Design an enzyme around this catalytic site. Structure first.
Site, PDB file in Angstrom:
ATOM      1  N   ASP A   8      61.731  36.503  -3.625  1.00 57.51           N
ATOM      2  CA  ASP A   8      62.340  36.167  -2.338  1.00 57.51           C
ATOM      3  C   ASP A   8      62.015  37.152  -1.214  1.00 57.51           C
ATOM      4  O   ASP A   8      62.676  37.144  -0.170  1.00 57.51           O
ATOM      5  CB  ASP A   8      63.862  36.023  -2.465  1.00 57.51           C
ATOM      6  CG  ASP A   8      64.263  34.917  -3.451  1.00 57.51           C
ATOM      7  OD1 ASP A   8      63.722  33.787  -3.326  1.00 57.51           O
ATOM      8  OD2 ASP A   8      65.133  35.205  -4.312  1.00 57.51           O
ATOM      9  N   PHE A  59      64.111  25.028  -4.715  1.00 55.15           N
ATOM     10  CA  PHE A  59      64.462  24.433  -3.448  1.00 55.15           C
ATOM     11  C   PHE A  59      65.886  23.856  -3.423  1.00 55.15           C
ATOM     12  O   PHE A  59      66.322  23.330  -2.401  1.00 55.15           O
ATOM     13  CB  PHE A  59      63.410  23.393  -3.065  1.00 55.15           C
ATOM     14  CG  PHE A  59      62.055  23.973  -2.759  1.00 55.15           C
ATOM     15  CD1 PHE A  59      61.871  25.353  -2.581  1.00 55.15           C
ATOM     16  CD2 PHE A  59      60.982  23.107  -2.506  1.00 55.15           C
ATOM     17  CE1 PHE A  59      60.606  25.879  -2.254  1.00 55.15           C
ATOM     18  CE2 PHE A  59      59.712  23.625  -2.208  1.00 55.15           C
ATOM     19  CZ  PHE A  59      59.530  25.016  -2.053  1.00 55.15           C
ATOM     20  N   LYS A  60      66.596  23.950  -4.549  1.00 58.62           N
ATOM     21  CA  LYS A  60      67.997  23.503  -4.664  1.00 58.62           C
ATOM     22  C   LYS A  60      68.200  22.176  -3.942  1.00 58.62           C
ATOM     23  O   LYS A  60      69.059  22.012  -3.047  1.00 58.62           O
ATOM     24  CB  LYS A  60      68.939  24.634  -4.228  1.00 58.62           C
ATOM     25  CG  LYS A  60      68.928  25.691  -5.346  1.00 58.62           C
ATOM     26  CD  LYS A  60      69.699  26.982  -5.064  1.00 58.62           C
ATOM     27  CE  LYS A  60      69.259  28.000  -6.144  1.00 58.62           C
ATOM     28  NZ  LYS A  60      69.637  29.455  -6.005  1.00 58.62           N
ATOM     29  N   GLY A 175      75.492  40.327 -13.029  1.00 56.06           N
ATOM     30  CA  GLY A 175      75.240  39.809 -14.367  1.00 56.06           C
ATOM     31  C   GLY A 175      74.459  40.748 -15.262  1.00 56.06           C
ATOM     32  O   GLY A 175      73.728  41.609 -14.787  1.00 56.06           O
ATOM     33  N   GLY A 178      71.974  41.037 -21.489  1.00 57.52           N
ATOM     34  CA  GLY A 178      72.510  40.774 -22.827  1.00 57.52           C
ATOM     35  C   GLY A 178      73.593  39.720 -22.916  1.00 57.52           C
ATOM     36  O   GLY A 178      73.517  38.833 -23.765  1.00 57.52           O
TER      37      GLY A 178
HETATM   38  C1  LIG Z   1      70.300  30.138  -6.872  1.00 55.35           C
HETATM   39  C2  LIG Z   1      71.428  29.586  -7.477  1.00 55.35           C
HETATM   40  F1  LIG Z   1      71.642  28.252  -7.516  1.00 55.35           F
HETATM   41  C3  LIG Z   1      72.382  30.420  -8.015  1.00 55.35           C
HETATM   42  O1  LIG Z   1      73.454  29.914  -8.620  1.00 55.35           O
HETATM   43  N1  LIG Z   1      72.298  31.752  -7.944  1.00 55.35           N
HETATM   44  C4  LIG Z   1      71.214  32.238  -7.348  1.00 55.35           C
HETATM   45  O2  LIG Z   1      71.176  33.553  -7.239  1.00 55.35           O
HETATM   46  N2  LIG Z   1      70.230  31.489  -6.843  1.00 55.35           N
HETATM   47  C5  LIG Z   1      68.994  32.119  -6.379  1.00 55.35           C
HETATM   48  O3  LIG Z   1      68.539  32.878  -7.543  1.00 55.35           O
HETATM   49  C6  LIG Z   1      67.944  34.132  -7.198  1.00 55.35           C
HETATM   50  C7  LIG Z   1      68.829  35.336  -7.529  1.00 55.35           C
HETATM   51  O4  LIG Z   1      68.158  36.539  -7.164  1.00 55.35           O
HETATM   52  P1  LIG Z   1      68.814  38.013  -7.205  1.00 55.35           P
HETATM   53  O5  LIG Z   1      70.319  37.845  -7.065  1.00 55.35           O
HETATM   54  O6  LIG Z   1      68.476  38.545  -8.582  1.00 55.35           O
HETATM   55  O7  LIG Z   1      68.179  38.761  -6.056  1.00 55.35           O
HETATM   56  C8  LIG Z   1      67.774  34.008  -5.698  1.00 55.35           C
HETATM   57  O8  LIG Z   1      66.507  33.381  -5.456  1.00 55.35           O
HETATM   58  C9  LIG Z   1      68.948  33.127  -5.265  1.00 55.35           C
HETATM   59  O9  LIG Z   1      68.636  32.336  -4.128  1.00 55.35           O
END
Ligand SMILES: *c1c(F)c(=O)[nH]c(=O)n1[C@@H]1O[C@H](COP(=O)(O)O)[C@@H](O)[C@H]1O
Ligand SMILES: *c1c(F)c(=O)[nH]c(=O)n1[C@@H]1O[C@H](COP(=O)(O)O)[C@@H](O)[C@H]1O
Lengths: 213, 213
Positions: A8, A59-60, A175, A178
């Protein structure tokens, strides 16, 4: 591996450098709108050609069926191997994505419950039903939250052992690799790697924890 | 006007031609992922410069707060005047969008209930609460479904008369300009215009119906 990089960063040069640095520790790169809206869909093709890794387009997808099809067709045309789609808009929206993925020989991941605190407001209460809707539609790939391993457990229970389950929220969001990999097949990690002083060392550190499980 | 064009053609040439043909009947163009994922974010700047109309980026933003901010910042940087964001992921995700819109002098539209049949499964049951969450966050712009004017009525009741409410699902999806504009401030219309043999005549026909109200 069991490790998927959430790429990202919003600058092509940095995205390429960090991905190159950690690629020996992953086989899948998750690319979403922060990078795509900054650098264009051509970034997906570049990543594929440079790195060889699987690309999941995060892209959710959350629109009506007709628009969902268009979004999926553009995304696969750009070279993505899989797309993440929201279950909350309902079965017709999901089916639209599955139909395109069938046409194009690609994969859909169904997002059930999200990892952030706000997910508790509306999504969590629907998430079991969203998972069961997935099963009923023949979805085989799912996304669920590292931040709530008890919910991961319940989601795994619904989808069964033969579905693939990946999980964001490791590291920055609190999170743990493990607690999460007890239930998920693979963890998604973004900032803990890509904001690290040494992303390779961060990824290596995570892989070491995973191997110990 | 009270008419917003949903420009979901996927080819720059056709998108520009149809928009040019109907511009005398609209003052706002809604651009979403079908066009952006096909032609790049630069399409937003081009539309602004060529046509002068307001641009709403219909990205149905549905991620975690940190990612939502990045998506909003990229979208406004590209020149969009407003962005549509999902309420279902919860208040923190919405606030993230509102914070960026504040920073950048732009607008957020909160999507409450969607227009397609699948919206009945999970979204509809949460939609009143999503609207009330919007009010509590100080959201002033909302999206609700032309296909269910009784739900539009209820949503209008929640948001009050001083909020702006726009509504997709007119034409192709079965919604009616008149039943919808009893409650919404403006209708969104895509395929009924952009797939018409003569898009100008289609838009003109809709405007004639609106004037008669
Ligand atoms: C998308 C999603 F639907 C979630 O429930 N949680 C979530 O964090 N995301 C995406 O996953 C990645 C997490 O990255 P990090 O927190 O390790 O930086 C991101 O791309 C977020 O948009
Ligand atoms: C988005 C949304 F959240 C809805 O509830 N309904 C809906 O249709 N959309 C988008 O609005 C436009 C409708 O266009 P038309 O049906 O007139 O062709 C599309 O951009 C659709 O994605």
């Amino acid at each position: 591996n069991r490790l998927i990089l959430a790429m990202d960063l919003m600058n092509r040069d940095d995205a390429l450098r960090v991905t190159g640095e950690v690629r020996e520790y992953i086989d899948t790169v998750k690319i979403g709108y922060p990078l795509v809206l900054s650098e264009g869909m051509d970034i997906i093709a570049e990543f594929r050609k440079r790195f060889g890794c699987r690309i999941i387009a995060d892209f959710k997808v959350a629109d009506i069926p007709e628009t969902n099809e268009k979004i999926c067709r553009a995304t696969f045309k750009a070279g993505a191997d899989a797309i993440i789609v929201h279950g909350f808009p309902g079965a017709d929206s999901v089916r639209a994505c599955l139909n395109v993925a069938e046409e194009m020989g690609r994969e859909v991941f169904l997002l059930t419950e999200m990892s952030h605190p706000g997910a508790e407001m509306f999504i969590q209460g629907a998430a079991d039903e969203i998972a069961r809707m997935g099963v009923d539609l023949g979805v085989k790939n799912y996304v669920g939250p590292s931040t709530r391993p008890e919910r991961l457990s319940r989601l795994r229970e619904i989808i069964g052992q033969d579905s693939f389950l990946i999980s964001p929220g490791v590291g920055a969001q609190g999170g743990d690799p493990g607690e999460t990999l007890r239930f998920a097949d693979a963890i998604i990690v973004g900032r803990s790697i890509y904001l690290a002083d040494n992303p390779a060392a961060a990824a290596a550190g995570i892989i070491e924890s995973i191997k110990d499980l």
